[PDB]
Amino acid sequence: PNNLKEIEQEIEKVKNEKDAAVHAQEFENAANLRDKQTKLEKQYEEAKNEWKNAQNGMSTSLSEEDIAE
Amino acid sequence: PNNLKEIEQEIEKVKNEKDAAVHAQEFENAANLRDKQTKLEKQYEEAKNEWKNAQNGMSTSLSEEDIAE
After folding, report:
1. CB spacing of A27 vs B30 below 8 angstroms
2. Which of A18, A32, B5, B48 has the fewest CB atoms within 10 Å distance of its CB?
3. Binary contact (B27, A25; C-beta < 8 A)
């Protein structure tokens, strides 16, 4: 529901930036990048947990409209 | 004469310990390690250059006292 794609992209770009900075020997910002990545991972886990709980709370019954479509 | 015997040893331990801290999510001390490693690399080049500059000028000719050895 347009909630995990953004966090996944942010984690990917943070990882790419950290990998680029590793070759350039930049550890003063590497700690900040790692902390941001960990926070984004925690937020992604929380969002996934709440989304799966909400999905499991409801029942996806099949109606005649699906067959008609 | 006990010049690069210890400088190179310091570089060796910093590099290996640096990589382990990356996977251990320990960048609090890794930031200081990168600065120390960069400084040691500069010192190694300076020490090597001054050693060869003061020795390449002189020539080491043969001596008759060691021919009979």
Report:
1. yes
2. B5
3. no
